[PDB]
Amino acid sequence: LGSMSQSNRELVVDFLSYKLSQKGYSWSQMAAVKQALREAGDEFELRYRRAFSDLTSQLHITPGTAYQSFEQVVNELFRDGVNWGRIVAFFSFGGALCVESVDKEMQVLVSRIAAWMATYLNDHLEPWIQENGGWDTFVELYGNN
Amino acid sequence: GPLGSMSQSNRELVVDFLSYKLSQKGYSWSQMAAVKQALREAGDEFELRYRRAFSDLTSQLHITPGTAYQSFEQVVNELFRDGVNWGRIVAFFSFGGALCVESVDKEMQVLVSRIAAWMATYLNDHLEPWIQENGGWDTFVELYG
Amino acid sequence: LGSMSQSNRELVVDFLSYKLSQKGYSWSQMAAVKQALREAGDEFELRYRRAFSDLTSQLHITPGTAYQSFEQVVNELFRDGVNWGRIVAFFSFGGALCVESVDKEMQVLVSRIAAWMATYLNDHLEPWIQENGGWDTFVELYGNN
Amino acid sequence: GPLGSMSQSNRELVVDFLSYKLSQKGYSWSQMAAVKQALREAGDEFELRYRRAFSDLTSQLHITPGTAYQSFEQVVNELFRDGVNWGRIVAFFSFGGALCVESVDKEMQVLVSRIAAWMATYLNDHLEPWIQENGGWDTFVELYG
Ligand SMILES: CCCN(C(=O)N[C@@H](CSCc1ccc(Br)cc1)C(=O)O)C(=O)c1cccc(C#Cc2ccc(F)cc2F)c1
Ligand SMILES: CCCN(C(=O)N[C@@H](CSCc1ccc(Br)cc1)C(=O)O)C(=O)c1cccc(C#Cc2ccc(F)cc2F)c1
Ligand SMILES: CCCN(C(=O)N[C@@H](CSCc1ccc(Br)cc1)C(=O)O)C(=O)c1cccc(C#Cc2ccc(F)cc2F)c1
Ligand SMILES: CCCN(C(=O)N[C@@H](CSCc1ccc(Br)cc1)C(=O)O)C(=O)c1cccc(C#Cc2ccc(F)cc2F)c1
């Protein structure tokens, strides 16, 4: 489904978000969390690139994977507990797995991964986030103002 | 999710993160994602190259608090005085971004969402038909990104 | 160009707009003007259906029509002056002409008509509107609260 | 144009008017327009048929001023307790519309934009993947409108 008058509005907000963040300003909390997370991810990938080779064959997540199985896989990443660094890792692994899915010509898995990750974030990680200083605490620790 | 302007969605944060990461590898979350990214990139290049033109824009372009859209439309018209093209449209985004940045600096953050709404308005009424007629943003992506 | 997370937000606002207006409430001024105009148009069409048969052959507006020629055609509708009733007529004639364009398998003309009508509204009619009580005066006279 | 939430575009008013008129003839401005229209229609039928269920919803569904999204998500979950389908999704829109209408009645117009944002949020996080997997809104249009 598409939306064309929103399209121009959407470009606007995205571009202004981008240019504000370059000066440490933020369109909104959501925009601040986005810049922060992108940045935290970049740094993460720079340091742990070694972990991102052949993720497909190791994580056992395919298009026909059930969310419960996805949940079991991610749970392994958080076996010794949830902390900010582990939450960044979660995003980075999702991202890398998407890229592989595109490399391997299974684009279909990308939107499956998005939806799985959103559910997991919703049910598992955001509640922890709310008990540990909230999304603003994420922005203080990883964002650029 | 974090508190946004129109929702506090977890999916929205995930989707932004995957879009970014897909783009770093030569891929796209979607056509919109690709447009957004090409436009950020084009804005960055424009602002560095024509850096000398980005001082006291709130004054040179007469955008103050209490400005009405008709005034804004009057100023932007001069930019497209000799016709629309993709360069002038990049200029339009960049100037509007620098205006917002200038606004926050001066503790006029109130201007920012107003500038957004004026830019979206101007696009819709003045720029859209030229854009469509010229192959759409799809063409922008192909010529730029 | 499409936009998918806005898509759900867009449905929301549209549906809530619709349900509010059914009780004489309005999401925004823009939403009030939309309900009012749709209604004014319905009434107009009911009374003057006789004027809407074979508009294509009489208005001389094709896909290759220049906006200046479009402007000349619409100007004829406003020859004896602009008033609210004539402004409603303008919308109704545009609408009917679009429908014929779809009947005659020239859909391409519809978006051309939208853009022409938006320019004409912008340059000719909205200024008159601003000197005659504004968009709220349109809502008082044609809307349902 | 009239003052909207995200812009004051003239095109936006035109486009809304032509969409309406195209739809009255069995046509569509676009896929989104068609979805919007089918959904309004489906909401109308649902609210008349299940009219008896639409009293004191602010109370039965505990949506008051100062309500947080987590609370809202908790209430809406019960509606989809036994699974998602297109009927339950129509119900979701209608109830949210009646809630907004109820809000304005009680001089709690402040709730309306908050309800919008919560509905958009819930759609994105909870309903989107089911919708996509089930053929998208394109399927809704084909089964309903
Ligand atoms: C094939 C194992 C992948 N992996 C690693 O390679 N870890 C590395 C450690 S170095 C990477 C690292 C660095 C810092 C932190 Br904090 C956590 C991890 C290793 O064991 O050598 C993992 O740590 C790991 C273990 C278990 C689950 C996952 C995952 C995942 C995942 C899948 C999908 C998705 F959408 C999101 C995800 F987080 C990731
Ligand atoms: C103070 C800036 C005035 N300005 C310039 O400095 N132009 C420069 C050219 S260098 C900038 C440039 C470079 C390439 C292109 Br294509 C277009 C412009 C000059 O001719 O010396 C403009 O190009 C100009 C002239 C008239 C109006 C505008 C504007 C604007 C504007 C205002 C608000 C907003 F949201 C967006 C806008 F684009 C911008
Ligand atoms: C082929 C003539 C169409 N037309 C009529 O048939 N008028 C009727 C009068 S009855 C319709 C009517 C009723 C009330 C009012 Br106020 C104004 C008109 C007639 O002369 O018998 C017009 O009045 C007319 C005359 C000149 C121009 C136009 C137009 C137009 C138009 C075209 C495109 C567009 F996007 C918007 C437009 F308004 C419409
Ligand atoms: C006070 C209404 C409670 N309610 C009912 O009356 N259900 C009725 C069924 S008749 C309504 C109906 C008819 C068909 C379908 Br499919 C689903 C519901 C009943 O079982 O007697 C619900 O269906 C119900 C139950 C639990 C939660 C909700 C809700 C909600 C809601 C809140 C906010 C919002 F923005 C959107 C929402 F959908 C609605």
Residues of A in contact with C31 (CB under 8 A): none
Amino acid at B40: R
Chain D, 16 to 35: residues with Cβ < 8 Å from chain A are: 30-32, 35
Q: Residue with the nearest Cα to atom 39 of ligand 1?
A: A77
Q: Is the CB of C89 under 6 A from ligand 3?
A: yes
Q: How far apart are CA D85 and CA D91, in angstroms?
A: 10
Q: Residue with the nearest Cα to atom 39 of ligand 4?
A: D79
- DSSP string covering chain A: ---HHHHHHHHHHHHHHHHHHTTT--SSHHHHHHHHHHHHHHHHHHH-GGGGSS-HHHHT--TT--HHHHHHHHHHHTTT---HHHHHHHHHHHHHHHHHHHHTT-THHHHHHHHHHHHHIIIIIHHHHHHTTHHHHHHHHHS--
Q: How far apart are CA D2 and CA D34, in angstroms?
A: 24
Q: Residue with the nearest Cα to atom 9 of ligand 2?
A: B53
Q: How far apart are CA B38 and CA A30, in angstroms?
A: 22
Q: What's the full length of chain C, in residues?
A: 145
User: How many contacts, defined by CB atoms under 8 Å, are there between C and D?
Assistant: 146
Closest by alpha carbon to B92, among B52, B114, B61? B61
Amino acid at B42: A
Both ends of chain D: CA-CA distance in Å?
Answer: 31
Closest by alpha carbon to D94, among C22, A86, A46? C22
Residues within a 6 A CB radius of ligand 2: B 50, 53, 57, 60-61, 63, 75-76, 78-79, 87-88, 91-92, 95-96, 99, 115, 119
The residue ranges of every structural domain in chain A are: 1-145
Determine whether D117 is exposed, middle or buried from the number of CB atoms within 10 Å of its CB (0-12, 13-18, 19+): buried
Residues of A in contact with D124 (CB under 8 A): 118
Q: How far apart are CA B61 and CA B56, in angstroms?
A: 8
Q: How far is the CA of B56 from the centre of ligand 2 (A)?
A: 12
Residues of D in contact with C115 (CB under 8 A): 11
Say if residues C119 and C67 touch (Cβ distance below 8 Å): yes
Resolution in units of Å:
2.3
- DSSP string covering D60-111: HTT--TT--HHHHHHHHHHHTTT---HHHHHHHHHHHHHHHHHHHHTT-THH
3-state class of B106 per DSSP?
A: coil
CA atoms C124, C130, C131, C132: torsion sign: positive
CA atoms D56, C12, B111, A138: torsion sign: positive
Question: Nearest by CB to A5, which of D12, D125, D129?
Answer: D12
Method: X-ray
Determine whether D49 is exposed, middle or buried from the number of CB atoms within 10 Å of its CB (0-12, 13-18, 19+): exposed
> Which residues, other chains included, contact A33 with Cβ-Cβ below 8 Å and sequence gap of 6+?
A135, A138, A139, A143, B1, B2, B13
Determine whether B80 is exposed, middle or buried from the number of CB atoms within 10 Å of its CB (0-12, 13-18, 19+): middle
The residue whose CB lies within 8 Å of the most ligand 3 atoms, and thus the one to mutate among C77, C83, C90, is C77
Say if residues A30 and B13 touch (Cβ distance below 8 Å): yes
Mutate to test the interface with B, among D5, D8, D13 (most CBs of B within 10 A): D8
Q: How far apart are CA C130 and CA C10, in angstroms?
A: 29
Which atom number of ligand 4 is nearest to the Cα of residue D60? 1
Chains with 3 or more CB pairs under 8 A to chain B: A, C, D
Q: How far apart are CA C40 and CA C91, in angstroms?
A: 10
Packing angle of the helix pair C4-21, B10-23 (nearest 10 deg): 150
Amino acid at D14: V
Q: How far is the CA of B79 from the centre of ligand 2 (A)?
A: 6
Q: How far apart are CA D8 and CA C142, in angstroms?
A: 20
